Design a protein around this ligand. Structure first.
Ligand SMILES: O[C@@H]1[C@@H](O)[C@@H](O)CO[C@H]1O
Length: 295
């Protein structure tokens, strides 16, 4: 509108429940603060070109600022540098190879991987009495800032703290839950010693959880996932998933827009905001802080 600035938000994938939570936050902020917030994004996290094109087009429209969740770390570096020459850019969720961001709101993704490692070890110990056995990691797609950090944090913690755990597979999907499902089924049928799995985002949690639920493997294979939705929360209760590391996507959207507005007015903002991570299990999913995060 007239006399009201425009601050687009560009998410990785508009069809994902996780990104829909981010967009809900951004939307509410737009309403609260009197900012027009176009809700932008490709329909797949793997559509990196799609995101770059959307960023270029949003830049060309001369908005006051842009909030973006860069879909791939290296590929978004230069596009963000370019955008930043004319529009301030606020990052959320997942890093890019650019120092041009005015602020960044994100989970500490390396710590999130460490938290997942601890949760997986604990789950294996409850099942078997000890922290030993073959485990796997399954990652939605390669090259994402958030996911590569979760992978690192997990692998590092396993290596130093859980020497009885052996990482026997480190697999990447193509951004689809069904591929997660198929990878999980393939992995286990081939290596029946697998006792544990880290599924490092919502999409992989959906697919891996589905594989464990459908095959009645909850008492043999412990899954730690990320994020939350109806399906994955169902798996947490049913036992198909042992734990979910839950982030604050609503705040990333809300405080992303709020921060971008402040930057657009020339206000000094914090460079980095840690939006937090919590391991959610059956034992704590009703804790009031947690309930507010998983709804
Ligand atoms: O934060 C991640 C996001 O970067 C996307 O890759 C997957 O869903 C969320 O876990």
């Amino acid at each position: 509108s007239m006399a009201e600035v425009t601050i687009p938000i560009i998410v990785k994938d508009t069809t994902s429940f996780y990104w829909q939570i981010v967009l809900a936050g951004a939307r509410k902020a737009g309403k609260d603060l009197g900012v027009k917030v176009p809700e932008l994004g490709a329909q797949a996290e793997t559509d990196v070109n799609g995101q770059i094109s959307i960023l270029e087009n949003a830049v060309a429209g001369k908005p006051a600022a842009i909030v973006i969740s860069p879909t791939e770390f290296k590929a978004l570096g230069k596009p963000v540098d370019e955008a930043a020459k004319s529009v301030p850019i606020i990052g959320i969720d997942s890093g890019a190879d650019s120092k041009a961001f005015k602020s960044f709101l994100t989970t500490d993704n390396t710590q999130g991987g460490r938290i997942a490692a601890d949760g997986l070890a604990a789950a294996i110990k409850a099942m078997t009495g000890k922290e030993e056995g073959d485990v796997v990691i399954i990652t939605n797609t390669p090259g994402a800032g958030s996911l590569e950090q979760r992978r690192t944090g997990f692998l590092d913690q396993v290596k130093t703290k859980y020497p009885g755990l052996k990482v026997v597979a480190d697999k990447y999907a193509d951004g689809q839950a069904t591929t997660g499902l198929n990878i999980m089924t393939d992995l286990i049928t081939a290596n029946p010693k697998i006792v544990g799995v880290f599924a490092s985002n919502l999409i992989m949690a959906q697919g891996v959880g589905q594989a464990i639920a459908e095959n009645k493997l909850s008492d043999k294979v412990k899954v730690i996932g990320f994020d939350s939705d109806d399906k994955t929360l169902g798996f947490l209760k049913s036992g198909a998933i042992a734990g979910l590391v839950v982030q604050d996507p609503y705040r990333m959207g809300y405080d992303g827009i709020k921060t971008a507005l402040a930057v657009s007015k020339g206000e000094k903002v914090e460079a980095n905001v840690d939006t937090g991570a919590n391991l959610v299990t059956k034992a704590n999913m009703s804790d009031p802080k947690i309930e507010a995060l998983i709804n």
